[PDB]
Every structure is written in structure tokens, then in C-alpha cells.
Design a protein around this ligand. Structure first.
Ligand SMILES: Nc1nc2c(ncn2[C@@H]2O[C@@H]3COP(=O)(O)O[C@H]4[C@@H](O)[C@H](n5cnc6c(=O)[nH]c(N)nc65)O[C@@H]4COP(=O)(O)O[C@H]3[C@H]2O)c(=O)[nH]1
Ligand SMILES: Nc1nc2c(ncn2[C@@H]2O[C@@H]3COP(=O)(O)O[C@H]4[C@@H](O)[C@H](n5cnc6c(=O)[nH]c(N)nc65)O[C@@H]4COP(=O)(O)O[C@H]3[C@H]2O)c(=O)[nH]1
Length: 36
């Protein structure tokens, strides 16, 4: 009805669309969390 998993951004408001993670990803990266 109302669980955790909540991200609040100015243009996006709602739960995180991320649930998959490929360390063998072949293509352009654009996620802030991909920074060391
Ligand atoms: N198709 C696709 N594009 C990807 C993916 N990962 C990153 N991107 C792209 O990278 C951009 C990073 O925007 P940001 O302002 O640095 O930072 C992001 C981020 O901080 C936040 N944000 C919005 N939606 C999400 C979300 O579902 N998850 C997370 N973790 N942050 C989000 O709002 C900012 C603006 O997001 P956008 O305008 O959507 O812009 C996103 C999006 O176009 C992915 O897996 N698939
Ligand atoms: N490290 C990294 N991996 C990336 C990036 N863009 C795509 N991927 C990978 O490619 C898959 C396909 O993304 P999609 O078809 O754009 O579809 C994405 C996208 O539409 C959405 N999404 C997630 N986070 C964001 C975000 O921050 N912004 C936007 N606009 N969409 C997001 O969630 C969907 C999840 O797709 P999946 O097939 O489960 O998993 C994602 C993810 O494993 C990226 O910038 N960095």
C-alpha cells in the first residue's frame, strides 16, 4: 500500500526505476552511481 524505496527528484517523483544491474554493460553510461 505504501512501502519504502522512495527517490525524490525535481523532474521525477516516485519509486526507483532501477532493479537490474549489468557489470558487463556494452553501451554509454549516464548514472551518477557509476562514479568511483
Ligand atoms: N534510458 C536510461 N537512461 C538512463 C539510465 N541511467 C541513467 N540515464 C540517463 O542519465 C540521466 C542522468 O540525469 P542526472 O541529472 O545526472 O540525474 C538524474 C537522477 O539523479 C534523477 N533520477 C530520475 N529518475 C531516476 C530514477 O529512476 N532513478 C534514479 N536513481 N535517479 C533518477 O533525476 C536526474 C534526471 O534524470 P533524467 O532526466 O531521466 O536523466 C537521466 C537519464 O536520461 C538508464 O538506466 N536508462
Ligand atoms: N550502468 C548503467 N546501466 C544502464 C544505463 N542505461 C541503461 N542501463 C542498463 O540497460 C538496461 C535497459 O535500460 P532501458 O531499456 O533504458 O530501461 C530503463 C529505463 O527506462 C528506466 N530507468 C532507470 N533509471 C532511470 C533513470 O535514472 N532515468 C530514466 N529516465 N530512466 C531510468 O528503468 C529501465 C530498466 O531497464 P533494465 O532492462 O531493467 O536495465 C537497464 C540497465 O541494466 C546507464 O546509464 N548506466
Amino acid at each position: 500500500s505504501k512501502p519504502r524505496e522512495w527517490v525524490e527528484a525535481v523532474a521525477y517523483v516516485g519509486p526507483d526505476r532501477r532493479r537490474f544491474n549489468s557489470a558487463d554493460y556494452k553501451g554509454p553510461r549516464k548514472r551518477k552511481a557509476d562514479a568511483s
